[PDB]
Amino acid sequence: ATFEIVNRCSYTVWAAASKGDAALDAGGRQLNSGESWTINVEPGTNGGKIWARTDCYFDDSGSGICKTGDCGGLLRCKRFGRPPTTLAEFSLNQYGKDYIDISNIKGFNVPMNFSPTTRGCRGVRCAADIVGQCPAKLKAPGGGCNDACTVFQTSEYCCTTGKCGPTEYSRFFKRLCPDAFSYVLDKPTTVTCPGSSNYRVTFCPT
Numbered sequence: 001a002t003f004e005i006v007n008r009c010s011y012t013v014w015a016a017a018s019k020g021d022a023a024l025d026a027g028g029r030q031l032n033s034g035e036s037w038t039i040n041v042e043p044g045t046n047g048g049k050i051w052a053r054t055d056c057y058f059d060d061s062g063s064g065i066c067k068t069g070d071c072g073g074l075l076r077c078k079r080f081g082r083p084p085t086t087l088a089e090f091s092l093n094q095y096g097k098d099y100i101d102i103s104n105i106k107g108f109n110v111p112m113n114f115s116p117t118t119r120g121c122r123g124v125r126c127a128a129d130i131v132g133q134c135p136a137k138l139k140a141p142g143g144g145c146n147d148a149c150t151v152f153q154t155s156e157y158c159c160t161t162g163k164c165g166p167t168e169y170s171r172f173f174k175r176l177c178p179d180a181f182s183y184v185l186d187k188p189t190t191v192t193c194p195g196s197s198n199y200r201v202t203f204c205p206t
Helices: 148-152 168-176
Strands: 002-007 013-018 023-031 036-040 048-053 087-094 097-103 112-116 124-126 191-194 199-203
Touching: 002 013, 002 023, 002 048, 013 199, 023 036, 023 048, 097 112, 097 124
Parallel strands: 002 199
Antiparallel strands: 002 036, 013 023, 013 048, 048 087, 087 097, 097 191, 112 124, 112 199
C-alpha cells in the first residue's frame, strides 16, 4: 500500500512510520513545508502508525533528537515516538478490510488529516488548535499537548485495568477533535476501508 505523506505546515516536520518493532519503509524522513514523501507499507501490516516530529537535529549518521515524537534519536524510526504525538493508525488486510483512525491517546503535536486516495470509505481529521488551547497541566514544555496518562501515570488515565471512563482531560481532546480517540476506551472512530486501499497523511491540512 502507498501512503503519500504531505507536509502542509509552514514549518519543517520529520515524518515517521513504524509498527512498533520495525520501521515501515525507511521509517522516517525530513519534510520541508510543502514537500511530499510516498512510502510503501507491506500488505497485512497490523498496528502501524505515522506521525510528525518537530524541532529535530540529526547528524550525518542519522542520530539525534526531536522535541516531539522522538523515536530513540533516530532519523529513520524503528520504534514508536515519544509523546506528545498526534497518531495516524492503521491495520491493513485484516480479514479483507483495512482499518484507519486518528488518536490523541499519546497527545497532540501537529494537526493531521488521514484519508484514503482510493474509493470506498471516508477520511478522518484532527485539525483543531489543540496546542493553543491545551489545558495548562497538559502543556508539554518541550512543545505540544500531552495526554493525561503521560503526565499523571494513573490507572484511570492509562486504562491499565481495562475499566476506565472519560475524564476532564480526555473530554478536552474530544471536544476539539470529535473524530479522534481521546482515551483508550473511547467510543471508536475507526473507519473501515476496502482491503488494500491507499492513503494520504496531510500535516496541517487547514
